[PDB]
Amino acid sequence: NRKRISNCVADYSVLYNSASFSTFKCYGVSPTKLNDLCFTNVYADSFVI
Amino acid sequence: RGDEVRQIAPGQTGKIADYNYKLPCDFTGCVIAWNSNNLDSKVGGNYNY
Numbered sequence: 001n002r003k004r005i006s007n008c009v010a011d012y013s014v015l016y017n018s019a020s021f022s023t024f025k026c027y028g029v030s031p032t033k034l035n036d037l038c039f040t041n042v043y044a045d046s047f048v049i
Numbered sequence: 050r051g052d053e054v055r056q057i058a059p060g061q062t063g064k065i066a067d068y069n070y071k072l073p074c075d076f077t078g079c080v081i082a083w084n085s086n087n088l089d090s091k092v093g094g095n096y097n098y
C-alpha cells in the first residue's frame with residue numbers, strides 16, 4: 001500500500017511514547033538531520049513480511 | 050530495550066540516542082550488548098529500569 005504524505009509537520013517524537021522499531025535505516029540522509037529538513041514528495045509504502 | 054540496541058551507535062536518532070545516551074561520531078571504542086532476560090526481568094514486571 002502506497003500512501004501520499006503532504007502538508008504536515010514531521011515531529012516523529014510522538015512515536016517515542018508507544019512505537020518501538022526493530023529496524024530503522026535511512027539512506028541518503030543522516031538520522032540526526034531529519035528534524036532540520038523539508039521533504040518534497042513523501043510516500044509511505046506499507047506491508048507485512 | 051532490545052529494539053533500542055541499534056540506537057547505541059554514532060549518528061543515531063531515537064529516544065535513547067536523543068534524550069538518554071548520545072555517542073560522538075569521533076568515537077573510538079567498542080559497543081557491546083547482550084540479552085539479560087534471565088537477570089533483569091521478573092514476573093509481574095521489573096520497573097527498576
Ligand SMILES: CCCCC/C=C\C/C=C/CCCCCCCC(=O)O
Pocket residue numbers: 005010012015021024034039042044056062063064
Ligand atoms: C507517516 C508520516 C511520515 C512522514 C515523515 C517523512 C520524513 C521524515 C522521516 C522521519 C523518520 C521516521 C520516524 C522514525 C522515528 C524514530 C525511531 C527511533 O526511535 O529510532
